[PDB]
Design a protein around this ligand. Structure first.
Ligand SMILES: Nc1ncnc2c1ncn2[C@@H]1O[C@H](COP(=O)(O)OP(=O)(O)OP(=O)(O)O)[C@@H](O)[C@H]1O
Ligand SMILES: Nc1ncnc2c1ncn2[C@@H]1O[C@H](COP(=O)(O)OP(=O)(O)OP(=O)(O)O)[C@@H](O)[C@H]1O
Ligand SMILES: Nc1ncnc2c1ncn2[C@@H]1O[C@H](COP(=O)(O)OP(=O)(O)O)[C@@H](O)[C@H]1O
Lengths: 54, 505, 108, 496, 108
């Protein structure tokens, strides 16, 4: 007559992935992309003070 | 008690008030000086649709508790591991919080479970975890005595043994169907908006209405009244005097079908072909049935009777049972036949039958009919084969006396007597009625005049031909009626009716 | 996470640490005989075995007291009742007459 | 139109009355309506049109999957944002507030049995309980009714259920005209195209795939053109007829097999055939005429190969009733037991839904799975049939059932013979004249051959006794080997 | 971002627009049936919804043919398989003997 055939229900697991804040944007965001123009200024101090020391 | 909207339930409120609230009413100085905790659980049980939700709700308002938090049984389950039980845990959070914060001056909380037996079966799968989770928290290591939990169920005899111990579910209460006084009070409460606002005529006497309605469940009375009012207003469409008179009430009363009442429709269908007394036996049979009905109604000790009717196939057995039933006037009537049960699974059939048995014990007065036995038992002679379990269900059922003063008559029918003795079941039955088929010509005469088969010439000639031809006439009524119709709608009565009728006997 | 505070004190103040107590209520729901039932996903074994590893592992403790309460002694897993883990087992049973008298006394 | 009157009379009556009596009495308005049916029926049309017809507010159309929101928790904010206007209008006026209708395309999409759960909680919270908003009416619809969460399925919530339907002749014809308008005006259909017969072709089709058909026939016309004759572009029936092969429906029809069961044709080789046919005609008349005989059962039995199914099918086809179907073992192959029982049950339920009906069951033993060794057989199916055959249909409805069999003695053994009203026997032919009739009807040999066959058989085989099937196949096989008698007579002789 | 160019050009020039074609090789990667569960981060839903918005309510963009290549039809949302969206489905099965000969011809 009868027996077993399909059984369980209460039993499962799940992993979990993750995205990230957008503002993050490219690494260049404050104190990163400005270092290009901040360097020309610093080269200006170096120079103007080279005039100073000479 | 009755100042609030609940009629007929009197003892229950005395008991509940005495046991539950007599320790929350007095000033805490006293009861603290007394040193007793509070009851922390309640189980009230009964048939559906009796007003259990209502009583549960009103209790909270009486105590000025917080708004009730509600949940229903089967929804608790989820299909992930341990969230089915997380939900059970969530419910007590706010009570915990307010207890820790305030202390002993916190305001009482209320929780309502619905259909408790749907999950909380005896333990020993998810089920054990659920039962466990509720136990460990209902009364745990940390004290929490500002809460109250209410339980609602139909089957008390299936809940796990541990929840019913003094400490978790102390007070057990039963809710039964309304009595006559209950019905009268129910009408009084329900028809208050109509009464003061003056849209009920003065002719309607609700006491008569109460008397007329028996085994009405207490919810459906609302259905009746709203239907009647809707009927009246729809009939109107004028704003002279919108009055509801008795005719609306009678109409709506006629329309509605209670759940615990007569199932007229299938019985009328059962006897569709009519009852004509073509011979002398019929009278006697019906007299027997009436006698037994009286014996059931009047006695005290014979609270149950089992009565069997049997005879040859096609003898028209079931119709007599339906007739006897319909001429009795009892409030509760149901019919079990193979027709309903067709297509179901085995477990389904046993469940159905057993439900149908248990319901009757509630009502004061009941008759219950079984259409055929070998068919239900799945008999087939080669081997032979049949289902043992259903047989045992029936065998056990036919001895169970009603649990209380309620009363029951059981009627059953079969055509296979011999098999039943070879089964060793015959001891179930106290008394027997026999239904043989016709063996005479004058009986043919009576039936054919009643059917008005043809004019007298045809009638006389056919009885003469069968007199001279068939000496030992013997058939049941089924073939007689169907053959008569066949001859009628066919040609030349001698050509077929006589020939068929010989070929059948 | 139940053991963190205990170990933390043990490492710092070696012997003098105060006693930590942890109570398990209903031990018999999660810690069954490992391997018998159809786990399906294989969670129960992990719970049991994690507890085994921590209770008396390669790193010693001498601070902790653990309590367990149940109705069905027999179903608990076999290895946990080894002395050194759950050493002393006690039976609570229905009281006789003198017990009942004492209960009445101390209740009222 | 019947739904058009049910909903009007039953549901939508309370709002008509002066609002004062409704507030005073306490009567509560019907709230929830579920339209359900297969895709493509145009349900969104009726849903909009009910609102427009009843002079209700302008609906909010919301898609099913669109309820699922990007942000966690914002779906529920949307659910609560929707009702603000109706709730405020109710606050301002109350009993005089206008009727607000909300239409939910693909309700099942999100309200399945954790955003999709909070939305359930959230709707359920506002829709009943603290609120008594009898102006927020809702009209949901779903193609798949089973996925609805049981939490919502209770009285007072979605109380009225409405069935949708599929195209009729004049409706499909009118939509055909509607689509063809622009082309028929501009003289670019060949006049030979008759629209009505195209409707007669398209039986299980809905408008969008009608457009598919039109575009396809056009594309074939294009194919004819491309390997400056644009003036000759005219869509001809052969484009449309050829295009019929590409598109496909999602329906099924079974009438065809009750037509293929008589593929071999009738030959009327003997008089008893005619007698039987007359009897069947008599019985169908009997059913049609008498108001009391609402259930008639016949049994047809005979030796294997005598020919039993074709006869019943012939009776049924000459009957001409609205509803005819067939149960044969062929359809039931490959399933498990619990599935055969359900299939049979469904078919029986489907036959009670028309004034006059005919039903035919084939070769009972195979349905019961009889084998004589044990004997073994499946009892449950047997008892299913036993109870089914004796059920009087619901009031005013009439059936006529014919069942064919070939193992009468076994049938006698199970004691089921009581279920039938009248029996018919079908013996196979035995006389050589009948062979001659069949033979001339088979026009396989010339006159001389058709005489020599009977001459040879008369002197070899007095008792003929073979089923017609064997005769037909024997003729067929003999036509290739040796057309002369010197094959067929012998082959019949081993078949004698 | 893919649809911008053709959109702009079309919007400007009306119907003169040159026909633009886009082909997704290996479509079944991400367009699984949107009415699905597993309840991770819902990006796998948003994506398909986006395409559908740009594909059905095109707002009169009639110079685009999107071609999908797959090995297994079944995986895909039925909500892409409907009129107005992926109408024609072409099955390409194993070659015959004559085609086998042409394949030799071309390879050799
Ligand atoms: N006095 C009567 N004698 C015989 N038949 C009657 C009588 N009164 C009514 N009937 C008809 O008998 C039928 C109902 O009886 P029923 O069909 O149950 O007979 P049965 O023998 O129990 O059936 P079965 O042969 O299936 O066991 C109806 O047609 C009913 O009208
Ligand atoms: N005179 C005839 N009567 C009936 N069928 C005929 C006749 N001549 C030819 N045939 C053909 O016989 C074919 C097969 O008949 P049918 O399917 O009834 O066989 P059957 O004897 O029921 O088979 P089985 O032994 O499996 O039950 C029909 O398609 C029909 O056209
Ligand atoms: N004894 C009663 N008195 C007044 N109303 C009742 C009574 N019993 C049921 N009702 C009505 O039925 C509804 C309550 O349903 P209830 O019967 O409590 O649900 P259930 O019994 O199915 O849990 C309310 O409208 C209530 O007024």
């Amino acid at each position: 007559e009868v027996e077993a055939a399909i059984s369980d229900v209460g039993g499962q697991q799940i992993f979990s992935q993750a995205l990230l804040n957008a503002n993050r944007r490219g690494e260049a965001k404050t104190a990163l992309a400005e270092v290009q123009a901040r360097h020309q200024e610093l080269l200006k101090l170096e120079k103007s003070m080279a005039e100073l020391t000479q | 008690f009755e100042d609030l909207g609940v009629g007929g339930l009197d003892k229950e409120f005395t008991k509940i008030f005495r046991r539950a609230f007599a320790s929350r009413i007095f000033p805490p100085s006293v009861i603290e000086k007394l040193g007793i905790s509070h009851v922390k659980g309640l189980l009230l049980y009964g048939p559906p649709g009796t007003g259990k939700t209502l009583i549960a709700r009103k209790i909270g308002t009486m105590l000025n508790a917080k708004e009730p938090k509600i949940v229903n049984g089967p929804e608790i389950l989820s299909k992930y591991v341990g969230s089915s039980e997380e939900n059970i845990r969530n419910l007590f959070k706010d009570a915990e919080a307010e207890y820790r914060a305030k202390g002993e001056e916190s305001s009482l909380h209320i929780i309502i479970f619905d259909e408790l037996d749907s999950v909380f079966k005896q333990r020993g799968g998810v089920g054990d975890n659920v039962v466990n989770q509720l136990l460990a928290k209902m009364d745990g290591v940390d004290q929490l005595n500002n809460i109250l939990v209410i339980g609602m169920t139909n089957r008390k005899d299936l809940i796990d043994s541990a929840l019913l111990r003094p400490g978790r579910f102390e007070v057990q209460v039963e809710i039964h169907l309304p009595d006559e006084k209950g019905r009268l009070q129910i009408f009084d409460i329900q028809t208050k908006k109509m009464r003061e606002n003056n849209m009920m005529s003065d002719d309607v006497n609700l006491a008569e209405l109460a008397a007329l309605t028996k085994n009405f469940s207490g919810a459906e009375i609302e259905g009746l009244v709203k239907s009647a009012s809707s009927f009246a207003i729809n009939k109107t469409v004028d704003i002279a005097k919108l009055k509801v008179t008795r005719e609306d009430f009678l109409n709506a009363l006629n329309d509605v079908t209670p759940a615990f009442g007569i199932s007229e429709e299938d019985l009328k269908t059962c006897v569709e072909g009519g009852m004509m007394l073509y011979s002398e036996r019929v009278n006697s049979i019906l007299k027997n049935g009436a006698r037994y009905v009286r014996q059931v109604r009047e006695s005290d000790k014979s609270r149950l009777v089992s009565l069997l009717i049997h005879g040859p196939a096609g003898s028209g057995k079931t119709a007599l049972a339906a007739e006897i039933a319909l001429k009795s006037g009892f409030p509760f009537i149901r019919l079990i036949s193979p027709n309903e049960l067709s297509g179901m699974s085995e477990s389904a059939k046993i469940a159905y039958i057993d439900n149908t048995f248990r319901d009757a014990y509630k009502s004061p007065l009941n008759i219950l009919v079984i259409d055929s036995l070998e068919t239900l038992v799945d008999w087939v002679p080669i081997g032979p084969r049949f289902s043992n379990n259903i047989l045992q269900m029936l065998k056990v059922a036919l001895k169970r006396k009603p649990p209380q003063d309620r009363r029951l008559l059981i009627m059953t029918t079969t055509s296979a007597y011999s098999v039943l003795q070879q089964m060793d079941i015959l001891s179930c039955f106290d008394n027997e009625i026999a239904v043989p088929n016709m063996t005479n010509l004058d009986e043919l005469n009576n039936v054919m005049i009643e059917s008005n088969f043809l004019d007298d010439a045809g009638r006389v000639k056919v009885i003469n031909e069968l007199s001279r031809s068939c000496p030992n006439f013997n058939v049941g009524i089924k073939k007689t009626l169907t053959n008569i119709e066949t001859a009628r709608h066919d040609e030349d009565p001698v050509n077929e009716l006589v020939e068929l009728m010989t070929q059948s006997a | 996470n139940l053991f963190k505070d205990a170990e933390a004190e043990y490492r710092a103040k070696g012997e003098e640490s105060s006693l930590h107590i942890i109570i398990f209520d209903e031990l018999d729901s999660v810690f069954k005989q490992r391997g018998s039932r159809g786990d399906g996903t294989g969670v129960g074994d992990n719970v049991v075995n994690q507890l085994l590893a921590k209770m008396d592992g390669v790193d010693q403790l001498n601070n902790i007291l653990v309590i367990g309460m149940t109705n069905r002694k027999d179903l608990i897993d076999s290895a946990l009742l080894r002395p050194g883990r759950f050493e002393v087992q006690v039976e609570i049973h229905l009281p006789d007459e003198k017990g009942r008298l004492q209960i009445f006394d101390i209740q009222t």
